[PDB]
């Protein structure tokens, strides 16, 4: 060791960070008519039903 | 239909065409962490700073 032969000096560095998200989201706050459409075998009942408002400009 | 429909029964769906409700409420959670370390010091120190005469051989 007369000389800086086992002189030593070292550094070492490794980070990872990922991330990841979602969303989905949906609101419906309405009341509408329907009419039936048929009867199904077991008594269930298909409705269709539809309104059209125009309040100005569409 | 013609089929038989018990009365006290709570209506639970029973066929094909049947219809049945579904409340999601799901909620899913999972965590996992891990750390480890080690650290060695050593230092070490001898000097005279003044030697005897007997002793200036060594
Ligand atoms: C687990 C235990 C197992 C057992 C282990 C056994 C011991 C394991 C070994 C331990 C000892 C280390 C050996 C060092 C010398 C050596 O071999 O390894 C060197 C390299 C290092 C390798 C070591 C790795 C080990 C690996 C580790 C292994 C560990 C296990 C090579 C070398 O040789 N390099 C060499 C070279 O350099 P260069 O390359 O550049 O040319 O030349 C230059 C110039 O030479 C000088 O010039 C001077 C003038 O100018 C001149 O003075 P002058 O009067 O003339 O003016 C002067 O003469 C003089 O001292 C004059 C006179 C002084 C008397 C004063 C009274 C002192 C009493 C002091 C009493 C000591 C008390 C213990 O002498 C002596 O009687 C020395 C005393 C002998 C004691 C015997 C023990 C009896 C048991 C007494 C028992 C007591 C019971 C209670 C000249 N000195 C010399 O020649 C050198 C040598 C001459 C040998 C001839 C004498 C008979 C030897 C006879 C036999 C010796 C055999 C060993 O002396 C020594 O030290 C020898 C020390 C031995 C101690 C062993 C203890 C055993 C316990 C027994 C235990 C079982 C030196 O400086 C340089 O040596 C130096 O620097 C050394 C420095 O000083 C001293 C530092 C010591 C610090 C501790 C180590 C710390 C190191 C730690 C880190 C690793
Ligand atoms: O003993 C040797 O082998 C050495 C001692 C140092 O000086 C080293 O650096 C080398 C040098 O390169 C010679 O020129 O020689």
Known sequence: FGNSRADMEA?????????????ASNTFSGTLTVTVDQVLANGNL????????????? | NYGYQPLFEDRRPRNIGDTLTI????????????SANASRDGKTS?????????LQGL
Do not use: C, M, W
Request: charged share 15%.
């Open chain 1, 11 to 23: 550094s070492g560095g490794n980070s990872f960070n990922g991330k990841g998200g979602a969303n």
């Open chain 1, 46 to 58: 298909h409705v269709v039903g539809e309104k059209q408002i125009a309040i100005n400009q569409g």
């Open chain 2, 23 to 34: 409340v999601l409420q799901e909620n899913v959670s999972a965590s996992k962490s891990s």
């Open chain 2, 46 to 54: 001898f000097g005279f700073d003044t030697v005897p005469r007997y």
